[PDB]
Copies of this chain bind each other. A is one copy, B any other.
């Protein structure tokens, strides 16, 4: 119902240092925006979590919204083997990169934002580790992890991964496993708070709290491709002033509806609001939670 998942609440910017080709085709992200770093997020049979949580924020949008910090350097080079601070965490991972792509961004352990980049005109390989020679090359990156972000300012840096039965799972390592162990390549849920580390979890217990918030209402320009419109310019309830707005039953029940005096018809976001999680048995509001295929070492002796 209401296929309005293409509109991005708030700023909605998908730009990173390096992909200067799509600079003017990704800010903002509208219905006609042919941003290569965003079309792969809506493809079927690849990113199910982002399709389930469509009315939210991405990694780049979280970076531009002063939520997730950037690494140093935020984009490493995979050409020369002289050394870069991006392979030590990538070798333990195991992701797949589609054809005709140069950059590949993911989430690091320090809670920042790291990525890679191949020198033109070289593309990525199959293991997403080196750069190989070259159809038409894309002008963006590819999300290696299936995660979703939002707007939050909850504190929680003095924590630690509390997963019993393992020792060296993901990037964190509580103890060593030299005797009898069992390693594989599974997925482990992880949650990163404000200025914290990649704290892995055992089970995922998410809960979306629906509330009348401006970040849960999409709007587009009304005229006799649709262009997005700001949400912070609409009045509240019981008031007909400033930039007039209108919408469906949800917008008319939350805010005012001038119909004729309005200039942009709005709608309701298909499932949006505050997302909670259960970490250490305490309800906390995270920042970016997702999955990743890393090395999981279980304890047996």
Contacts and interface: CB of A to CB of B under 8 A. Distances in A.
Interface residues of A, number: 28
Interface stretch (A16-24, A62-70, A81-89): A81-89
Contacts of A164: none
Interface stretch (A201-209, A231-239, A260-268): A260-268
A180 to B, nearest CB: 14
Interface string A215-243: 00000001110100000000000000000
A244 B91 CA distance: 16
Contacts of A224: 130, 132-133
A151 interface: no
A131 interface: yes
Interface in A162-217: none
The 5 closest A-B pairs by CB, nearest first: A87-B260, A130-B223, A130-B222, A132-B224, A125-B222
Contact of A81 (B87, B88, B261): B261
28 contacts: A79-B223, A81-B244, A81-B261, A81-B262, A81-B263, A82-B261, A83-B260, A83-B261, A84-B260, A87-B259, A87-B260, A88-B260, A91-B246, A91-B259, A125-B222, A125-B223, A126-B222, A126-B226, A127-B265, A129-B222, A129-B265, A130-B223, A130-B224, A131-B223, A132-B222, A132-B223, A132-B224, A133-B224
Interface in A46-93: 79, 81-84, 87-88, 91
Interface of A: 79, 81-84, 87-88, 91, 125-127, 129-133, 222-224, 226, 244, 246, 259-263, 265
Nearest to A225: B126
Given A132-B224, A223-B131, A260 B81 contact: yes
Given A130-B222, A130-B223, A132-B222, 12 more contacts: A81-B260, A81-B263, A82-B261, A83-B261, A84-B260, A88-B260, A91-B259, A126-B222, A127-B222, A127-B265, A130-B224, A133-B224
